[PDB]
Design a protein around this ligand. Structure first.
Ligand SMILES: *[C@@H]1O[C@H](CO)[C@@H](O)[C@H](O)[C@H]1NC(C)=O
Ligand SMILES: [Ca+2]
Ligand SMILES: [Ca+2]
Lengths: 83, 82, 196
């Protein structure tokens, strides 16, 4: 809690969970990042930008590649199609 | 009572997931709620209700001592009966 | 060839350039029309966003964000707002005349807004299949306006506009069962005649 409560005030902290030996729970493929953008570029997404000027929010998210596709992190190569 | 799927956006309330964590946004009504995986309610609320609201999360004023004003309106020292 | 015209007749209907009325109740933000389509520079990115507008009512106040010349001018709630002025101000123009907000942006682009819901963008002879979105491609061919963002024609428009939402994680709309009577006029044959 203390992490977020400071973060809300306008001053965020970084990497504190690295040595704390406690990470908040998240499903497979993701673990807790800090200050990920809400507009997670997913798999079946339109490539538009500079509308998501929202503030930055903490939470768990995929690795660098491994785009989101239906609640899991899957590699960008295997983005399916839909019909 | 009817279990609905997710996401869900009826009546101006977008019920979405963000960063693997569930969100309920009420921007028209000036709030954002969410939950994490462990279960930790959080409420981001707009300054429009400055000095207005009163509930279990206290009033949105500046002071942090007076925000136990009961459903009648009574500054109660106890954080429990409140 | 003349100057075509999108439209939003009512809350959830859409008329294409080539002329194709179709039904699409949405609640997310959607790409009405743009230029960034396939193999193009992508000058303008007119968007539209509705809220509480799957069922038409006194609700469904629209929001419109139009993205041209690196600017951010948008409108809703009666007035227009400049969030980011664009570079070439010379082409910019606003004509608040009568009931409308006539709004030019260039040599071959113009927007009209009834102050209430309607969005009637007007494009000139310039493009001729240089755009895509919910209004189709502006090619003259009238039965290829449902070419989804994944580059295939779809038969069912409710799946189409789902392909054109911006936030790819919001709630996509629901395939409604087809009938001649909306919710109120459903099993309300009396009212159904009076409305008729
Ligand atoms: C809160 O409202 C009360 C009653 O109107 C007023 O007396 C008081 O000055 C207000 N305080 C703040 C912080 O706005
Ligand atoms: Ca307080
Ligand atoms: Ca066409």
């Amino acid at each position: 809690e203390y992490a977020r409560t400071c973060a809300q005030e306008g001053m965020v902290l970084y990497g504190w969970t690295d040595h704390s030996a406690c990470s908040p729970v998240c499903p497979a493929g993701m673990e807790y990042r800090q200050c990920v953008s809400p507009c997670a570029r997913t798999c079946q997404s339109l490539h538009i930008n500079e509308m998501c000027q929202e503030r930055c929010v903490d939470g768990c998210s995929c690795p660098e590649g491994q785009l989101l596709d239906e609640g899991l992190c899957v590699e960008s190569t295997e983005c399916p199609c839909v019909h | 009572d009817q279990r609905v799927s997710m996401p869900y956006a009826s009546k101006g309330l977008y019920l979405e997931t963000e960063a693997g964590y569930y969100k309920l946004s009420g921007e028209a009504y000036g709030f954002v709620a969410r939950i994490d995986g462990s279960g930790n309610f959080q409420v981001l609320l707009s300054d429009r209700y400055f000095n207005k609201t009163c509930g279990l999360c206290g009033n949105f004023n500046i002071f942090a001592e007076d925000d136990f004003m009961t459903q009648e309106g009574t500054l109660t020292s106890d954080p429990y009966d409140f | 060839v003349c100057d075509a015209t999108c439209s939003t007749i009512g809350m959830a209907h859409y008329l294409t350039f080539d002329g194709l009325k179709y039904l699409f109740p949405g609640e997310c933000q959607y790409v009405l029309v743009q230029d960034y389509c396939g193999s193009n520079p992508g000058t303008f990115r007119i968007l539209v966003g509705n809220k509480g507008c799957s069922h038409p009512s006194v609700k469904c106040k629209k929001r419109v964000t139009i993205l041209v010349e690196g600017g951010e001018i948008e409108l809703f709630d009666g007035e227009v707002n400049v969030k980011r002025p664009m570079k070439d101000e010379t082409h910019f123009e606003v004509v608040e005349s009568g009931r409308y907000i006539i709004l030019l942006l260039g040599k071959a682009l113009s927007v009209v807004w009834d102050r209430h819901l309607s969005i009637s963008v007007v494009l000139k002879q310039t493009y001729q299949e240089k755009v895509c979105g919910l209004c189709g491609n502006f090619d003259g061919i009238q039965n290829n306006d449902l070419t989804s963002s994944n580059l295939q024609v779809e038969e069912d428009p409710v799946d189409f506009g789902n392909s054109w939402k911006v936030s790819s994680q919001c709630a996509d709309t629901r395939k409604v069962p087809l009938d001649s009577s909306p919710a109120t006029c459903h099993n309300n044959i009396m009212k159904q005649t009076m409305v008729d």
